[PDB]
Design a protein around this ligand. Sequence first.
Ligand SMILES: *[C@@H]1O[C@H](CO)[C@@H](O)[C@H](O)[C@H]1NC(C)=O
Lengths: 194, 107, 120
Amino acid sequence: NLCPFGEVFNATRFASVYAWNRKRISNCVADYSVLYNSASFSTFKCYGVSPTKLNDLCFTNVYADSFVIRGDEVRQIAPGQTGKIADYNYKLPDDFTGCVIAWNSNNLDSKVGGNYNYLYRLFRKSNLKPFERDISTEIYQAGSTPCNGVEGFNCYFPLQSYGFQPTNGVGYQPYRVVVLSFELLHAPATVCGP
Amino acid sequence: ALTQPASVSGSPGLSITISCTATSSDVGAYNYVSWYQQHPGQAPKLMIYDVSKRPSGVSNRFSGSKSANTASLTISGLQAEDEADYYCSSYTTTSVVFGGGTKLTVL
Amino acid sequence: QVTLRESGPTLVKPKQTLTLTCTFSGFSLSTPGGGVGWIRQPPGKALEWLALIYWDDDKRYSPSLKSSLTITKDTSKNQVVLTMTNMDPVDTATYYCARLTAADTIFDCWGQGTLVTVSS
Ligand SMILES: *[C@@H]1O[C@H](CO)[C@@H](O)[C@H](O)[C@H]1NC(C)=O
């Protein structure tokens, strides 16, 4: 009857923002009391749904996401603003039900020098759509004179070397972010607790 | 590289503190720092891994603090353990520094 | 538990290639944020980190010894091989290979260490 609610939070390694991994949740029990009282989740601010009392409520087709961002863009992942992360990497819809619970992960995701395992997408000619995974890494063209596979002038790669440094500020440390998108439907629910 | 005093002394039963500053700009914010009570003869050992948090098992009263860029090692009244040395190490921008050696001689 | 012990040659001639290893046990290498390091200390001096390896085979070296120090890994036999050339008399020191459990905890477990001298 139990299901891996801990696997999505305590996973081995999360994916990047440009390749965020989506996971379907089915046949679970809503034991969110032990999640809110974990004393490790820094930002539990949930928009639309109260942080507590989630156990006396259960949805139909809840999903899950996983990515890592910087501390300054922790506020960027929200249906209230955009510009750098919710504009090319991963944007949440305006009618999103859930939250972006995240914690400081500056203990196993950073190393001396440059951590090039995680990356993010740079500026693009087009705007990102809600719930879109842009796996393609085509060379961005900033206008005329198409390079067509060459780097240099106005043809920088969309992915950028992140460079997770061990010593950083409060807004420059790694932060593992998980998104619990509640899909409110009318079908008989499958993930419902006590 | 980090700079710390040459050799701090002190009488038994009293309280002492070893300092460790960050004159060089290698550290970005001096977030992670750790000390090593190197027992002279076999190998160093960890006594405090974070700035203030200490590892389990080998810990009685050791602690530490840091205000802006200078670390510290606050010892209790216990000075009769041995003539142990201490090394403050932290992450730099490109390497892993260890500072110098401070022979903590007790009287 | 986590135990580190060095094994390999001790004496070496100048202008050669030293191969120092240390067999680890009691823990895994593919753990998130895990890795082993290598630190040396001349007699009467402080410690200096030479190089280390991570879970994703990331060979980070020292800026002064970037070319010579090359570190490898072998998870099948739980062995770590350190290759470095140009044996100099200043390199006469004891070499401890450490264990980096996480990025926060700096070198939790250490090894016994062997006194590798560089002379004639
Ligand atoms: C992840 O592991 C830690 C320590 O083992 C545990 O306290 C925490 O509850 C785990 N996560 C979840 C979602 O259970």
